[PDB]
PDB file of C-alpha atoms and ligand atoms in Angstrom:
ATOM      1  CA  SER L   1     -40.903  26.001   0.325  1.00 57.67           C
ATOM      2  CA  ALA L   2     -39.798  22.591   1.851  1.00 55.30           C
ATOM      3  CA  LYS L   3     -37.913  20.658  -0.905  1.00 51.75           C
ATOM      4  CA  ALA L   4     -34.130  20.435  -0.122  1.00 53.89           C
ATOM      5  CA  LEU L   5     -31.645  18.681  -2.342  1.00 52.33           C
ATOM      6  CA  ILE L   6     -28.322  17.412  -0.889  1.00 52.58           C
ATOM      7  CA  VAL L   7     -25.561  16.272  -3.606  1.00 52.62           C
ATOM      8  CA  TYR L   8     -22.294  14.860  -2.164  1.00 53.12           C
ATOM      9  CA  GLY L   9     -19.037  13.608  -3.745  1.00 50.91           C
ATOM     10  CA  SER L  10     -17.377  11.417  -1.392  1.00 50.43           C
ATOM     11  CA  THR L  11     -14.593   8.594  -1.737  1.00 56.76           C
ATOM     12  CA  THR L  12     -14.046   7.406   1.698  1.00 57.99           C
ATOM     13  CA  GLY L  13     -17.387   8.007   3.038  1.00 57.35           C
ATOM     14  CA  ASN L  14     -16.810  11.188   5.187  1.00 58.01           C
ATOM     15  CA  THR L  15     -18.654  13.760   3.269  1.00 57.01           C
ATOM     16  CA  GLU L  16     -21.384  11.060   2.574  1.00 60.75           C
ATOM     17  CA  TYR L  17     -21.818  10.660   6.461  1.00 59.95           C
ATOM     18  CA  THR L  18     -21.816  14.471   6.771  1.00 57.63           C
ATOM     19  CA  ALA L  19     -24.512  14.610   4.126  1.00 54.47           C
ATOM     20  CA  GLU L  20     -26.680  11.938   6.203  1.00 54.80           C
ATOM     21  CA  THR L  21     -26.146  13.954   9.372  1.00 55.82           C
ATOM     22  CA  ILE L  22     -27.493  17.373   7.499  1.00 59.12           C
ATOM     23  CA  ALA L  23     -30.220  15.336   5.774  1.00 62.22           C
ATOM     24  CA  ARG L  24     -31.723  14.194   9.257  1.00 61.48           C
ATOM     25  CA  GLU L  25     -31.330  17.686  10.730  1.00 63.70           C
ATOM     26  CA  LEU L  26     -33.462  19.244   7.815  1.00 60.31           C
ATOM     27  CA  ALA L  27     -36.098  16.368   7.753  1.00 56.39           C
ATOM     28  CA  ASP L  28     -36.463  16.918  11.491  1.00 55.00           C
ATOM     29  CA  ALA L  29     -37.250  20.466  10.815  1.00 53.61           C
ATOM     30  CA  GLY L  30     -39.834  19.600   8.374  1.00 54.44           C
ATOM     31  CA  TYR L  31     -37.863  19.680   4.889  1.00 55.86           C
ATOM     32  CA  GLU L  32     -38.498  17.043   2.402  1.00 55.13           C
ATOM     33  CA  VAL L  33     -34.991  16.063   1.634  1.00 52.42           C
ATOM     34  CA  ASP L  34     -33.691  14.219  -1.277  1.00 51.18           C
ATOM     35  CA  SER L  35     -30.154  13.213  -0.896  1.00 49.98           C
ATOM     36  CA  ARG L  36     -28.085  11.901  -3.953  1.00 50.64           C
ATOM     37  CA  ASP L  37     -24.624  10.833  -4.503  1.00 53.65           C
ATOM     38  CA  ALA L  38     -22.859  12.828  -7.183  1.00 52.54           C
ATOM     39  CA  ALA L  39     -21.965   9.769  -8.858  1.00 52.45           C
ATOM     40  CA  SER L  40     -25.717   9.127  -9.855  1.00 50.30           C
ATOM     41  CA  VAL L  41     -26.613  12.672 -11.119  1.00 50.33           C
ATOM     42  CA  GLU L  42     -26.723  14.662 -14.082  1.00 49.99           C
ATOM     43  CA  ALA L  43     -25.875  18.233 -14.047  1.00 50.29           C
ATOM     44  CA  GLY L  44     -28.728  19.714 -16.549  1.00 49.57           C
ATOM     45  CA  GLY L  45     -31.638  21.041 -14.462  1.00 52.46           C
ATOM     46  CA  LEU L  46     -30.324  19.145 -11.281  1.00 53.91           C
ATOM     47  CA  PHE L  47     -31.539  21.936  -9.002  1.00 54.24           C
ATOM     48  CA  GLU L  48     -34.957  22.247 -10.516  1.00 52.01           C
ATOM     49  CA  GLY L  49     -38.066  22.390  -7.992  1.00 52.41           C
ATOM     50  CA  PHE L  50     -35.594  22.577  -4.867  1.00 55.49           C
ATOM     51  CA  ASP L  51     -35.910  25.539  -2.666  1.00 52.99           C
ATOM     52  CA  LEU L  52     -32.542  24.751  -0.897  1.00 52.15           C
ATOM     53  CA  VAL L  53     -29.417  22.904  -2.443  1.00 49.32           C
ATOM     54  CA  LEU L  54     -26.499  21.617  -0.380  1.00 49.48           C
ATOM     55  CA  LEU L  55     -23.649  20.562  -2.088  1.00 51.31           C
ATOM     56  CA  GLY L  56     -20.741  18.451  -0.390  1.00 48.05           C
ATOM     57  CA  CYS L  57     -17.645  17.663  -1.809  1.00 46.10           C
ATOM     58  CA  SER L  58     -14.062  16.297  -0.396  1.00 46.17           C
ATOM     59  CA  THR L  59     -10.815  17.628  -1.546  1.00 47.76           C
ATOM     60  CA  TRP L  60      -7.937  15.902  -3.474  1.00 44.62           C
ATOM     61  CA  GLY L  61      -5.076  16.642  -5.786  1.00 45.65           C
ATOM     62  CA  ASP L  62      -1.346  15.483  -5.571  1.00 44.43           C
ATOM     63  CA  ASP L  63      -0.129  19.066  -5.864  1.00 45.45           C
ATOM     64  CA  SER L  64      -3.407  21.103  -6.881  1.00 47.10           C
ATOM     65  CA  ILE L  65      -6.652  21.508  -5.505  1.00 43.28           C
ATOM     66  CA  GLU L  66      -8.786  19.077  -7.101  1.00 40.79           C
ATOM     67  CA  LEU L  67     -12.495  18.106  -6.484  1.00 38.68           C
ATOM     68  CA  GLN L  68     -13.780  14.789  -5.674  1.00 38.11           C
ATOM     69  CA  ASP L  69     -14.002  12.727  -8.929  1.00 35.02           C
ATOM     70  CA  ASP L  70     -17.757  12.130  -9.024  1.00 34.15           C
ATOM     71  CA  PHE L  71     -18.330  15.795  -8.310  1.00 33.25           C
ATOM     72  CA  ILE L  72     -16.129  17.081 -11.124  1.00 36.29           C
ATOM     73  CA  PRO L  73     -18.765  16.655 -13.859  1.00 36.30           C
ATOM     74  CA  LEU L  74     -21.379  18.702 -11.903  1.00 36.07           C
ATOM     75  CA  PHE L  75     -18.754  21.465 -11.360  1.00 35.41           C
ATOM     76  CA  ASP L  76     -17.892  21.659 -14.863  1.00 37.35           C
ATOM     77  CA  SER L  77     -21.524  21.944 -15.977  1.00 39.73           C
ATOM     78  CA  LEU L  78     -22.665  24.042 -12.946  1.00 36.80           C
ATOM     79  CA  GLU L  79     -24.028  26.682 -15.416  1.00 36.23           C
ATOM     80  CA  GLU L  80     -26.686  24.272 -16.431  1.00 37.54           C
ATOM     81  CA  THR L  81     -27.986  23.194 -12.828  1.00 37.62           C
ATOM     82  CA  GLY L  82     -30.487  26.069 -12.223  1.00 39.39           C
ATOM     83  CA  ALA L  83     -28.365  27.937  -9.868  1.00 39.41           C
ATOM     84  CA  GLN L  84     -29.398  31.367 -10.525  1.00 36.67           C
ATOM     85  CA  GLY L  85     -31.254  32.867  -7.662  1.00 37.01           C
ATOM     86  CA  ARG L  86     -31.116  29.461  -5.812  1.00 37.05           C
ATOM     87  CA  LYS L  87     -30.365  29.239  -2.198  1.00 37.53           C
ATOM     88  CA  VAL L  88     -27.418  27.094  -1.770  1.00 38.73           C
ATOM     89  CA  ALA L  89     -24.822  26.284   0.994  1.00 38.38           C
ATOM     90  CA  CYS L  90     -21.751  24.178   0.830  1.00 40.57           C
ATOM     91  CA  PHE L  91     -19.772  21.480   2.762  1.00 43.67           C
ATOM     92  CA  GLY L  92     -16.984  19.345   2.669  1.00 44.30           C
ATOM     93  CA  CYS L  93     -14.463  16.986   4.343  1.00 44.03           C
ATOM     94  CA  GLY L  94     -10.638  17.614   4.254  1.00 49.58           C
ATOM     95  CA  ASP L  95      -7.594  17.382   6.299  1.00 46.75           C
ATOM     96  CA  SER L  96      -5.827  20.226   7.826  1.00 44.00           C
ATOM     97  CA  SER L  97      -2.452  18.699   6.933  1.00 41.96           C
ATOM     98  CA  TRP L  98      -3.163  20.318   3.691  1.00 43.04           C
ATOM     99  CA  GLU L  99      -2.519  24.001   3.260  1.00 43.51           C
ATOM    100  CA  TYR L 100      -5.761  24.660   1.081  1.00 44.97           C
ATOM    101  CA  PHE L 101      -7.911  22.984   3.825  1.00 44.64           C
ATOM    102  CA  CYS L 102     -11.216  21.890   2.174  1.00 46.72           C
ATOM    103  CA  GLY L 103     -10.268  23.854  -0.821  1.00 48.27           C
ATOM    104  CA  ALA L 104     -12.968  22.262  -3.211  1.00 47.62           C
ATOM    105  CA  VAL L 105     -15.543  24.196  -0.822  1.00 43.16           C
ATOM    106  CA  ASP L 106     -14.073  27.546  -1.843  1.00 42.84           C
ATOM    107  CA  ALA L 107     -13.833  26.565  -5.741  1.00 46.81           C
ATOM    108  CA  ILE L 108     -17.713  25.510  -5.599  1.00 50.44           C
ATOM    109  CA  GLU L 109     -18.682  28.631  -3.827  1.00 50.10           C
ATOM    110  CA  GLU L 110     -16.785  31.012  -5.851  1.00 50.02           C
ATOM    111  CA  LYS L 111     -18.281  29.421  -8.961  1.00 48.99           C
ATOM    112  CA  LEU L 112     -21.964  29.451  -7.444  1.00 45.92           C
ATOM    113  CA  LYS L 113     -21.663  33.152  -6.823  1.00 48.98           C
ATOM    114  CA  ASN L 114     -20.512  33.807 -10.389  1.00 48.35           C
ATOM    115  CA  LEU L 115     -23.576  31.668 -11.517  1.00 44.73           C
ATOM    116  CA  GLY L 116     -26.143  33.892  -9.295  1.00 47.94           C
ATOM    117  CA  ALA L 117     -26.618  31.596  -6.606  1.00 49.04           C
ATOM    118  CA  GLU L 118     -27.461  33.007  -2.990  1.00 50.39           C
ATOM    119  CA  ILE L 119     -24.924  31.361  -0.652  1.00 50.88           C
ATOM    120  CA  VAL L 120     -26.889  31.392   2.575  1.00 50.58           C
ATOM    121  CA  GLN L 121     -23.972  30.359   5.088  1.00 47.37           C
ATOM    122  CA  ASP L 122     -20.370  30.173   4.817  1.00 45.37           C
ATOM    123  CA  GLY L 123     -19.253  26.527   3.768  1.00 45.86           C
ATOM    124  CA  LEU L 124     -18.912  23.973   6.571  1.00 48.45           C
ATOM    125  CA  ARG L 125     -15.393  22.505   6.551  1.00 48.72           C
ATOM    126  CA  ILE L 126     -14.698  19.221   8.510  1.00 48.06           C
ATOM    127  CA  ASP L 127     -11.046  18.090   9.477  1.00 46.90           C
ATOM    128  CA  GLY L 128     -10.569  14.438  10.196  1.00 44.17           C
ATOM    129  CA  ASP L 129     -13.375  11.945  11.277  1.00 42.49           C
ATOM    130  CA  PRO L 130     -16.659  13.762  10.671  1.00 44.30           C
ATOM    131  CA  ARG L 131     -18.235  11.875  13.526  1.00 43.04           C
ATOM    132  CA  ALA L 132     -15.930  13.832  15.977  1.00 38.46           C
ATOM    133  CA  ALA L 133     -17.619  16.872  14.417  1.00 37.06           C
ATOM    134  CA  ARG L 134     -21.279  15.786  14.765  1.00 36.40           C
ATOM    135  CA  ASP L 135     -22.197  18.797  16.714  1.00 33.87           C
ATOM    136  CA  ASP L 136     -20.769  21.157  14.420  1.00 31.18           C
ATOM    137  CA  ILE L 137     -22.517  19.705  11.366  1.00 30.89           C
ATOM    138  CA  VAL L 138     -25.874  19.579  13.112  1.00 28.49           C
ATOM    139  CA  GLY L 139     -25.212  23.176  14.100  1.00 26.92           C
ATOM    140  CA  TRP L 140     -24.311  24.232  10.712  1.00 25.53           C
ATOM    141  CA  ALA L 141     -27.472  22.767   9.261  1.00 22.91           C
ATOM    142  CA  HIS L 142     -29.635  24.604  12.034  1.00 24.21           C
ATOM    143  CA  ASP L 143     -27.787  27.868  10.811  1.00 24.21           C
ATOM    144  CA  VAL L 144     -28.566  27.347   7.303  1.00 20.39           C
ATOM    145  CA  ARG L 145     -32.301  26.747   8.075  1.00 18.36           C
ATOM    146  CA  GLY L 146     -31.945  30.057  10.141  1.00 18.93           C
ATOM    147  CA  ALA L 147     -30.683  32.082   7.230  1.00 19.38           C
ATOM    148  CA  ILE L 148     -33.215  31.128   4.538  1.00 21.07           C
TER     149      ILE L 148
HETATM  150  C1  FMN M   1      -3.801  13.078  -2.522  1.00 21.32           C
HETATM  151  C2  FMN M   1      -4.762  13.360  -1.469  1.00 21.32           C
HETATM  152  C3  FMN M   1      -4.729  15.030  -1.577  1.00 21.32           C
HETATM  153  C4  FMN M   1      -5.572  15.890  -0.465  1.00 21.32           C
HETATM  154  N1  FMN M   1      -5.806  17.107  -0.510  1.00 21.32           N
HETATM  155  C5  FMN M   1      -6.447  17.711   0.311  1.00 21.32           C
HETATM  156  C6  FMN M   1      -6.571  19.157   0.459  1.00 21.32           C
HETATM  157  O1  FMN M   1      -5.912  19.798  -0.577  1.00 21.32           O
HETATM  158  N2  FMN M   1      -7.205  19.585   1.065  1.00 21.32           N
HETATM  159  C7  FMN M   1      -7.894  19.129   2.260  1.00 21.32           C
HETATM  160  O2  FMN M   1      -8.665  19.592   3.090  1.00 21.32           O
HETATM  161  N3  FMN M   1      -7.989  17.815   2.203  1.00 21.32           N
HETATM  162  C8  FMN M   1      -7.229  16.923   1.291  1.00 21.32           C
HETATM  163  N4  FMN M   1      -6.982  15.540   1.450  1.00 21.32           N
HETATM  164  C9  FMN M   1      -7.716  14.932   2.370  1.00 21.32           C
HETATM  165  C10 FMN M   1      -9.149  14.336   2.170  1.00 21.32           C
HETATM  166  O3  FMN M   1     -10.125  15.355   1.549  1.00 21.32           O
HETATM  167  C11 FMN M   1      -9.834  13.521   3.325  1.00 21.32           C
HETATM  168  O4  FMN M   1      -9.177  12.464   3.292  1.00 21.32           O
HETATM  169  C12 FMN M   1     -11.380  13.569   3.247  1.00 21.32           C
HETATM  170  O5  FMN M   1     -11.663  12.898   4.446  1.00 21.32           O
HETATM  171  C13 FMN M   1     -11.864  12.640   2.164  1.00 21.32           C
HETATM  172  O6  FMN M   1     -13.515  12.918   2.392  1.00 21.32           O
HETATM  173  P1  FMN M   1     -14.296  11.950   1.691  1.00 21.32           P
HETATM  174  O7  FMN M   1     -14.437  10.521   2.401  1.00 21.32           O
HETATM  175  O8  FMN M   1     -15.793  12.352   1.669  1.00 21.32           O
HETATM  176  O9  FMN M   1     -14.038  11.734   0.381  1.00 21.32           O
HETATM  177  C14 FMN M   1      -6.286  15.073   0.377  1.00 21.32           C
HETATM  178  C15 FMN M   1      -6.086  13.637   0.581  1.00 21.32           C
HETATM  179  C16 FMN M   1      -5.414  12.901  -0.363  1.00 21.32           C
HETATM  180  C17 FMN M   1      -5.341  11.279  -0.341  1.00 21.32           C
END
């Protein structure tokens, strides 16, 4: 039950760093972790064979909530990923200057629920430089593991 997939959409590297930090935590605990940039993936069957899936995505939009561009195709085809009955958790970087702080995380969680996923922990929301939140990131990964 030890295969974890992490897929991240990141433009300035913050959610990517967050993904790398989570990946190390899971690997140290005994998971086999496959980490992929969303730009490199196709949605159809993306979750097949994974016991745990973690989705990371930063939040954008001039005057609306928009997902990071590389993640949008995955979100638009999320119903083809194999999410039904899948244990999933979400994370993302943002900036609390914006009212909808890490709003991409909400959008992804809400769709995953409709699609039959089991959300194993509330999404991780990181404000500003994620290296300043390293302890929170590692703690969230630990908490995700404990809720499996
Ligand atoms: C036009 C623009 C819109 C943004 N909108 C939001 C937002 O609605 N909510 C939020 O939390 N952060 C928002 N951000 C902040 C980014 O998500 C933040 O820079 C984040 O660190 C980027 O993470 P990444 O490097 O993983 O892509 C916005 C940034 C820009 C430039």
